[PDB]
Amino acid sequence: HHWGYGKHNGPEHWHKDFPIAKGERQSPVDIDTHTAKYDPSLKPLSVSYDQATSLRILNNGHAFNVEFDDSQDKAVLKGGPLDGTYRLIQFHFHWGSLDGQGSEHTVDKKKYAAELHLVHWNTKYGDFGKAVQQPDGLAVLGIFLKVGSAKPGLQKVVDVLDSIKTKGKSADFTNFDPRGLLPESLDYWTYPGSLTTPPLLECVTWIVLKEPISVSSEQVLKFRKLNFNGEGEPEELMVDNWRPAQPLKNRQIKASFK
């Protein structure tokens, strides 16, 4: 049974094919802001996206991925909790069927309308495929989305979605600047975790920003027009593609701010 987000193949089923689903460092988690400790030894976070080169956008049947050329040292994350340099490979979102749900992480149980994941691999492991064999192979910057004013820098993504409606469709998607998706502040929480989709590998230093970005109702409505199914199969709207919060299991969440 191909994994997904439905009643018979959704998150409660994943552990059968991917037993790490019940591991010690699974994501997402609820961020209890009152038990996250400020860590003054955290270096400032460095998000350097000015030379980023997007290549393509792809509906993979679970979300849409905007992919980058990661063959050179061009869009990198470093500092904060990280001990090396991590290179951007792709970003994607999780979102709900309703504005009241859709994020993976929660903040004192609060769910946002959506959540953006910018996925980076540790350059000391040479590429993404080898990085995912390592416990510190990945760093994911998570950014919450709330519904309000439109985010202009998101609109180029919104407008290509009609060309990738169904699973397996891809489109050229060059010159997209992910700096237009970032909120003002880089204040964050950080904790060790996992990929939130199968194979759920425990490679990730999570860096979750406190400040959400606002997107318009119309922008998120266009996300909900995508399809999980392939062309020529019955239409199932791509909505509620979020894994719920998982047990923290005595991990600690650190805050970059007071």
Give the annotated binding-site residues for Zn(2+): 92, 94, 117
If we measure between CA atoms, which residue out of 4, 144, 125 comes closest to residue 60? 4
Task: Give φ, ψ of 117 to 5 degrees.
Answer: -120, 115
Task: Pick the closer one to Zn ion by CB: 36 or 208.
Answer: 208
39 or 56: whose CB is closer to Zn ion?
A: 56
Length of the chain: 258
SS3 179: helix
Interface stretch with Zn ion, choices 27-35, 117-125, 176-184, 244-252 (CB under 5 A):
117-125
Q: Does the bond joining 199 to the residue before it have cis omega, within 30 degrees of 0?
A: yes
Counting residues that bind Zn ion (by CB under 5 A) gives 2
- In the complex with Zn ion, the residue whose CB is nearer, 39 or 240, is 240
* Minimum distance from residue 119 beta carbon to Zn ion (Å): 7
Catalytic residue list: 62
DSSP string, 78-105: EETT-SS-EEEEEEEEEE-SSTT---SS
Tell me which stretch binds Zn ion (CB under 5 A): 109-117, 129-137, 226-234, 239-247.
109-117
Closest distance to Zn ion from the beta carbon of 192 (Å): 16
Q: Which own/partner contact pairs does 83-86 have at CB distance under 8 Å and 24+ positions apart? A: 83/136, 84/122, 84/123, 84/124, 85/122, 85/123, 86/120, 86/121, 86/122, 86/123, 86/138, 86/139
**Separation in Å, CA 98 to CA 2, 204, 210, 223:** 25, 28, 22, 11
* Residues flagged as binding site: 92, 94, 117, 196-197
Q: What is the nearest approach in angstroms of Zn ion to the Cβ of residue 195? A: 7
* Residue 117 is a binding residue for Zn ion (CB under 5 A): yes
Q: Which is closer to Zn ion, CB of 39 or CB of 199?
A: 199
Binding positions for Zn ion, 173-202, rule CB under 5 A: 196
- Residue 19 DSSP SS3: helix
Contact between residue 254 and residue 190 where contact means Cβ atoms under 8 Å apart: yes
Residues numbered 195-254 forming contacts with Zn ion, rule: CB under 5 A: 196
Q: Virtual CA dihedral for 185, 137, 254, 188, nearest 10 degrees?
A: 10
Q: How far apart are CB 41 and Zn ion at their closest, in Å?
A: 28
| Stretch touching Zn ion by CB under 5 A, among 5-13, 116-124, 146-154, 222-230 | 116-124
Of all residues in the shown chain, the one whose CB is closest to Zn ion is: 117
Minimum distance, C-beta of residue 114 to Zn ion, in the bound complex (Å): 11
- Of 75 and 118, nearer to Zn ion (C-beta) is 118
Per the annotation, binding residues for substrate are 196-197
Nearest residue to 205 via CA among 218, 196, 192, 194: 192
Task: Please give the residue ranges that form the binding site for Zn ion (CB under 5 A).
Answer: 117, 196
